[PDB]
From a paper:
The crystal structure of W194A was determined at the resolution of 2.02 Å. Comparative analysis revealed that mutants H228A and W194A exhibit a significant decrease in kcat values for ACMS decarboxylation by 142-fold and 26-fold, respectively, relative to wild-type ACMSD, indicating the essential roles of His228 and Trp194 in ACMS decarboxylation. The 1.9-fold increase in KM value for W194A suggests a minimal role in substrate binding, potentially shielding the active site from the solvent. Interestingly, mutating His228 to Tyr abolishes the tautomerization activity, while H228A and W194A mutants exhibit comparable kcat and KM values to wild-type ACMSD. These findings indicate that His228 and Trp194 are not involved in catalyzing OAA tautomerization. Despite the structural proximity of Trp194 and His228 to the active site, they are unlikely to be the base, as demonstrated by the comparable tautomerization activity of H228A and W194A mutants compared to the wild-type ACMSD.
ACMSD, the enzyme responsible for decarboxylating α-amino-β-carboxymuconate-ε-semialdehyde (ACMS) to produce α-aminomuconate-ε-semialdehyde (2-AMS), plays a crucial role in controlling QUIN levels. This zinc-dependent metalloprotein is situated within the tryptophan-kynurenine pathway, where it competes with a spontaneous chemical reaction that converts ACMS directly to QUIN. ACMSD functions as a dimer, with residue Arg239∗ from the adjacent subunit being crucial for the decarboxylation reaction.
Author numbering:
A (entry chain A), B (entry chain A): 4 to 36, 38 to 333
Write the structure that this text describes.
């Protein structure tokens, strides 16, 4: 069996549907050619997309071709709405999470969905998380930060702890990338800022001592192999050993906390995957493709399948780990 | 023989010396206890430092203890002065580069120095680079960016090309880190922003096509193992294969340009070093410690010496590569 736990969808939202929330910032889908289409914002074009992003039937055909039995899918991060007024964002989140379940309803045995939450208000976010999971979502996908609040911020740690106590799994996705006016060309935000964003989120939890407070029951996974986290961990441990301000809130070597989280396998390179599995363990890396975006893996699972990891490790990564992490059969 | 090509010094600058340039932004050294001291700016304390940073005699004692035969050293990046008026910055650069040669004069067989340049004015920077090297410097150390100008910017590429045509080697050091108002605690700028800064500098050259224009004669090295560059290269190659805007200026797979630059070995982890050498080749990684700072390597060369790389590879990394790169015996 083969599970892909990192992929995205975008629902068939009309311009008028979106305008009832926000004419300028609520995204919607314009479908033409329906082979091609575009995530729209207001009247401006936001991003060109193709049919698998919005069409569960077409998607199942590609999944069959790729040999993917079960795909876990979740919002495109442009849908997050973290800057909106909280109550409007919560209404948006519930509408998007209902759309997701409608997408999955096409074939709920093979399409699983994770939900978004109005993270700018802890109470509303906790309530939508429980509501979405009760309605059929297998967990939540959040952005890695909320403006200048990183995951060490008590509000975000409290959302994680809520999910832990309710056995709700979390996928953390980089979004709203740092960088200012730099990285204008060649998709540098996706190549530089995204992996740094995810590393920052992981280190924000470790170095703030959040894992000393969050129950071990938390199931939390970081996208894109955890960014650069695994490769730069030796530098973190060395800093921790030599500067008291790095130890202030983190009572043991930072690298020891890798038993508290998961990463997907999307590192697009054999040696990077081997290092990732070295650092994280064969039990904490899960096949994820970033389907259907261009910077995802074209042959889903190809990197893991063609690796020199043992047959046992390949089975956990392509199926066993996500089956346990998301409660899939 | 053993060469450490990444280390820093700070000269015995008095408050009045610095005030003749800028009472508020020119750094200086306050030496007390002389065991301890502090890089000062204006009347405010900037960073606590210890004696090896400013004392060549004391430094030689530690080098003897560590088994370091030759150390290459260069400005502490707070000395760069890239925001200053250009002519004042050029006068500062020449004074700092003279101090560096005075530091090295204590034992020029075992202490080599690289120079700083007033990078905010290409003509003055090119002139100081040639002048410093003529006076005895073995190359130049620059910051990785100049404000919102990264290394793809024609002015910085032109400085690199000048050095290439004059056989002047370059060390590129992360500095003035991205991140805005985030990363306030646990030295996250050094752990997250610095490796991303260096990755951004390397990718700025590759993805802009600068290596198609800069002569192959350029000898250029990136600090801290090149940041996260080597681990995230598979993600870059995949993006390049699937988005035309990533290929616009870079006519072949980005990973093929690793034969155009060097990195130091300071990745503080055995598996990271093995991956680094895999990506870069045993001929393009050089032992560097970041001495004498806390986030440097305590036992200089310990990671390389205790590795499972071949005896031949260990010899290139700890001695042969830098001997050739800097023209040392
Ligand atoms: Zn994604
Ligand atoms: Zn340094």
């Amino acid at each position: 069996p083969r599970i892909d736990m990192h992929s995205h969808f975008f629902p068939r939202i009309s311009e008028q549907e979106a305008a009832k929330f926000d004419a300028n910032h609520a995204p919607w889908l314009q479908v033409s050619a329906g082979d091609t289409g575009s995530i729209m914002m207001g009247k401006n074009n936001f991003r060109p997309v193709y049919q698998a992003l919005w069409d569960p039937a077409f998607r199942i055909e590609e999944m069959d071709a790729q040999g993917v039995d079960v795909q876990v899918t979740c919002a495109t991060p442009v849908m997050f709405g973290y800057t909106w007024e909280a109550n409007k964002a919560a209404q948006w989140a519930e509408r998007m999470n209902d759309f997701a379940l409608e997408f999955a309803a096409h074939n709920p045995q093979r399409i699983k969905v994770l939900a978004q939450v109005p993270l700018q208000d802890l109470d509303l976010a906790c309530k939508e998380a429980s509501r979405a999971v009760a309605a059929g979502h297998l967990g939540i996908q959040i952005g890695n930060h909320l403006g200048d609040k990183d995951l060490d911020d008590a509000t975000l740690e409290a959302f994680l702890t809520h999910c832990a106590n309710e056995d709700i799994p979390i996928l953390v996705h980089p979004w709203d990338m740092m960088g200012g006016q730099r990285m204008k060309k060649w998709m540098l935000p996706a190549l530089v800022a995204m992996p740094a964003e995810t590393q920052l989120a992981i280190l924000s939890l470790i170095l703030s001592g959040a894992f000393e407070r969050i129950p071990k029951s938390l199931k939390i996974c970081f996208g894109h192999g955890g960014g650069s986290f695994a490769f730069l961990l030796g530098r973190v441990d060395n800093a921790w050993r030599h500067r008291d301000i790095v130890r202030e809130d983190c009572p043991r070597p930072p690298s020891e906390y890798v038993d508290r989280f998961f990463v997907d396998s999307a590192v697009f390179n054999p040696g990077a995957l081997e290092l990732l599995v070295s650092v994280m363990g064969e039990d904490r890396v899960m096949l994820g493709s970033d389907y259907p975006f261009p910077l995802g893996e074209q042959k889903i699972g190809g990197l893991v399948l063609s690796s020199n990891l043992g047959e046992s490790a390949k089975d956990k990564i392509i199926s066993g780990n996500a089956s346990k992490f998301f409660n899939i059969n």
